[PDB]
Design a protein around this ligand. Structure first.
Ligand SMILES: *[C@@H]1O[C@H](CO)[C@@H](O[C@@H]2O[C@H](CO)[C@@H](O)[C@H](O)[C@H]2NC(C)=O)[C@H](O)[C@H]1NC(C)=O
Ligand SMILES: *[C@@H]1O[C@H](CO)[C@@H](O)[C@H](O)[C@H]1NC(C)=O
Ligand SMILES: *[C@@H]1O[C@H](CO)[C@@H](O)[C@H](O)[C@H]1NC(C)=O
Ligand SMILES: *[C@@H]1O[C@H](CO)[C@@H](O)[C@H](O)[C@H]1NC(C)=O
Ligand SMILES: *[C@@H]1O[C@H](CO)[C@@H](O)[C@H](O)[C@H]1NC(C)=O
Lengths: 40, 49, 127, 97, 48, 48
């Protein structure tokens, strides 16, 4: 069964992060990615 | 306009427990859990005014 | 005309240099931008640095040695076990704590959150 | 806005680029003193003074934004001129031409 | 950065020396009232 | 639209990082900026 549906907004995924006060995260590895910006 | 000014990042982040932010007191700007709205105290003053 | 002035600003600060402006020239830390022509427009190739594969470590604001606080000249004081290391903020390159990359100012009692460890010197073992 | 504030006060500025690396806050602020040419030791030496100054500044900006005459006229002018445009349109429709 | 301030009078532009200035006014002066509001906003904008 | 693009630039580099641009993100040396919502607007807390 396929039909038109109405849903509330998906504001985003819930990201769980812990501030603490004696913990740091540092990126071990990195990625390079090119993105296209189109301007008339 | 409001989409590109307000949703530059589309990753929602929960409010951390307000404890030991180095003495920096983020009660005014962060939304208090006293009300079910996600509005802060100065945000409420701006919306009322 | 507003979009054309925006594109000439991006042609000037993304292609002809490197922009420290976040999100102006790419989703991430900007590295380059390659212009490409288009019908009544310009398409940009915004190459950016994007880090990943993060790790969580325990840090301290400074190091106490011989009654003096030692501060990172660059990077962050990091730890996993017992050994304390200094590394730059954007990439994990663990370096042993030495006076060449550590800056000293004041004593160790004025600052909160200090941990104590051996700060190595490069000069005494040769001498 | 709450998500932006949580990323700002918990991750620092790495949430814009990459995947929101956490950072103790006194250390993000020292790292943001490092961007204005002052060395981080000044912050770590005067953390209580910086925290008290920031708390007082937040209190002062709340008292200023709670006096009624707030510099909120630029936001009020948009709604006022839109309502003026609409009511001018219906008073225009009142004319006989 | 700035442009010369300008403003228009409704009577001296469209009325002039017309005898039926009232007949021109009650039917068509609200347009010029809007136009004077726009010109006053432009002058204030150039000062700011 | 012009004011919205200005505000999204200030969300883009006053809130999401640190600005070396003088006076663009606050009077003095900018540290951070805390965004705050408003009726049809955004109110900034440019701490410097
Ligand atoms: C944290 O990482 C360092 C990076 O090498 C590890 O250092 C080792 O420490 C042990 C002592 O416990 C030495 O015997 C080794 O020679 C060191 N190097 C290596 C490559 O093993 C350290 O073990 C790590 N700590 C934890 C808890 O994982
Ligand atoms: C880092 O780069 C890519 C991950 O995208 C992977 O192929 C490579 O092996 C990684 N290197 C290390 C040391 O993790
Ligand atoms: C933050 O500020 C509020 C209001 O001034 C205060 O009640 C609260 O105790 C403060 N936070 C801490 C951890 O003291
Ligand atoms: C972090 O908070 C804990 C309390 O949970 C405290 O014991 C510790 O001293 C704090 N460390 C710093 C660096 O503020
Ligand atoms: C290291 O710093 C701590 C601060 O908690 C202090 O108690 C300790 O005495 C210091 N180390 C030495 C060897 O004095």
């Amino acid at each position: 069964s396929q039909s038109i549906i109405a849903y509330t907004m998906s504001l985003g995924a819930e990201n769980s992060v812990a501030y603490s006060n004696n913990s740091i995260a540092i990126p071990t590895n990195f990625t390079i990615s090119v993105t296209t910006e189109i301007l008339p | 306009n409001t989409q590109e000014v307000f949703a530059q990042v589309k990753q929602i982040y929960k409010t951390p427990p307000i404890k030991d932010f180095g003495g920096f007191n983020f009660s005014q700007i962060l939304p208090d859990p006293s009300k079910p709205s996600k509005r802060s105290p100065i945000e409420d003053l701006l919306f009322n005014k | 005309r507003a979009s054309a002035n925006l594109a000439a600003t991006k042609m000037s600060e993304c292609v002809l240099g490197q922009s420290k402006r976040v999100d102006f020239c790419g989703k991430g830390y900007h590295l380059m931008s390659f212009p490409q022509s288009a019908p009544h427009g310009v398409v940009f190739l915004h190459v950016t640095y994007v880090p990943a594969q993060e790790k969580n470590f325990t840090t301290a604001p400074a190091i106490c040695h011989d009654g003096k606080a030692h501060f990172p000249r660059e990077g962050v004081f990091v730890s996993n076990g017992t050994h304390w290391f200094v590394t730059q903020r954007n990439f994990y390159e663990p370096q042993i704590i030495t006076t060449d990359n550590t800056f000293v100012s004041g004593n160790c009692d004025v600052v909160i959150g200090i941990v104590n460890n051996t700060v190595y010197d490069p000069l005494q073992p040769e001498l | 806005t709450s998500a932006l504030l949580a990323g700002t006060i918990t991750s620092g500025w790495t949430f814009g680029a990459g995947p929101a690396l956490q950072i103790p806050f006194p250390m993000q602020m020292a790292y943001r003193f490092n961007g204005i040419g002052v060395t981080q030791n000044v912050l770590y030496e005067n953390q209580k003074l910086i925290a008290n100054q920031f708390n007082s500044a937040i209190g002062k900006i709340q008292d200023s934004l709670s006096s009624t005459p707030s510099a909120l006229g630029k936001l009020q002018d948009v709604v006022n001129q839109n309502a003026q445009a609409l009511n001018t349109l219906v008073k225009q429709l009142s004319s006989n031409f | 950065v700035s442009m010369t301030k300008t403003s228009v009078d409704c009577t001296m532009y469209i009325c002039g020396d017309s005898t039926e200035c009232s007949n021109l006014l009650l039917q068509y002066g609200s347009f010029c009232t809007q136009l004077n509001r726009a010109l006053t906003g432009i002058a204030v904008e150039q000062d700011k």
